[PDB]
Amino acid sequence: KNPKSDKFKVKRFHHIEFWCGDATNVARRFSWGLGMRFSAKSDLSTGNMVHASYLLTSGDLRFLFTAPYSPSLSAGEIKPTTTASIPSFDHGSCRSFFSSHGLGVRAVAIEVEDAESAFSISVANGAIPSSPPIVLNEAVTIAEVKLYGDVVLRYVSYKAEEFLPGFERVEDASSFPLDYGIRRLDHAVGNVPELGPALTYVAGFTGFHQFAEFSGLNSAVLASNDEMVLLPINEPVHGTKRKSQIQTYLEHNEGAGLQHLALMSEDIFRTLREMRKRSSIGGFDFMPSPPPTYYQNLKKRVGDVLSDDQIKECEELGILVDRDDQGTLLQIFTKPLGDRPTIFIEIIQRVGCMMYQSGGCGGFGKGNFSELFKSIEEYEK
Template identity: 35%
Template structure:
């Protein structure tokens, strides 16, 4: 596990402030938005569709504190771009948007360094003000939108209206208590992680923040490599993963195969009270990964030799199956949902940090073993031959 202190060069102008919103392309935006509201504690924020004059794409925007997700679906049979994306990838993340200062400058610098600009900077305007946006291509079919809000006072973006319907059930459910997007993880095929990392360093002036390799992260069957890139202010963190060859197919490789290439594997959402959050989310019917009780026996033994004191009750953490990772300075608490669609691709994480800026490396083995149990149930924990080909047993 390696942490990096060199932040690289700072933009002389323009900067990345935070995650703005994350857009999912899904088969049924109305139902996907409803799932996140009912199960994860989001609330409807904004809508764009036939009733607002959008004839090609419908979008439902949901929010929880600073987290905004947009679920978009094609309205017409002839929408080839969205149709092909859905056929290839299933429901998944199409775009990760950043709130930026000086969109024009950031796009110009990225262009000079060789980035592919999908949409040059353009402005949207309504009675609430103006927003400037631009779109860049990143790994696979995934894009990044730069959002310069220019004092915009509307609900979300120009062209969006208030939701058509507010579900009366939502106010009766316990709050999700999720605050902001902590990090967004992208999975790559083997040997494609470093080129993607280099893309962020070169084109967005991000820097290496943290990394682990397959010698540090492995189970009996599989392993991974991961490098986290971050903006200069370290408010945007993007772990980039790839599988490492093991005895059996890793969950990273399973993702790449079912998603049809590189893409967003999971979104981590930060909370300041993970115990209440997970109790409430479980009460709402959210399904999480389960680690065995032996994990907590080993955790108690490790903590005896540590300077760090966990302020939460370990019995409660064990009951809720919340994972703990720690070093000499602090600790983090985290838990992962099961995949949130039928394909074993995108899932979600809830994380609480106590002076610990890592990504749960101490839990990767336990998490992998839990995922491997699910992989086995799906018939996907296949044996790999020396060439890396799957052999069914």
């Protein structure tokens, strides 16, 4: 069931913005680890005396890394005379965010038809305003409302049809064309103390509907009309034998925030080969692999979708597989992206639901909680 209840026209995920202490080092690490190209910049060299912002791209995936400069460089500016390219940026907010939460996602940005309308309708329907609509160079409108914790949902709309005015394309010499196959953001997941109030709030101001589904958590997924913007939310389940990873997140993050970004690959085997080659030379580490019992059990579960060789390739790379009533999901999780056991990345590829592929084909892998549990006990035997 999809009531198509969006209160404003939503297109696709546009970008994810990380708030950093040093944007250069995080961006360079992420570029090498994920195979993303340096695409645009806004910093001292482009006249921005307020913040350093670096954009990485892979296909349609856009990761932005932003850090504040010394406020002294811009102490004579006021908002009408600002040299910031992102007018919602605030030195104090950014330092406070980073000191509270560590490295993490500040903004989940979606492209909409009209960011001013999206903002107005959102706030009229209960959204907490974070940054009012501002028109940049008569070309792009950006607005922000609170999503959960200190994460904002950012609306971006373009008059035309390059990232944002005031960003400059990066010189080709500094722009090595890395590509490990990642192509777009599939979903972005928040952790909260209480799922109910978080869902009611977000669904209330967006009109996003609950996406039909089918340890240590309860979850639900909010989706736009064409189910291409997917915003799952988790809450902890307390009292369990094993401590909830959602609760650990909330403790180390100092509350609610973005838990994981799931990045679609056009070839998850190539993506994982390339990422695993770089894990110990500056890239990202992956969660410990499931026991061989897990891959022995894949024949019964997905032997009609994956060949024995493709299954054994999943086993070499530690890839998990789950299945819906409509499609199949290949997925794997990185270790946390930074110092704290908080945000991590998921790499996914979806098989099925061809019409274009429909959103959320194969689900989100919740069946892998029981399958992992089973395969662990089976391997113990």
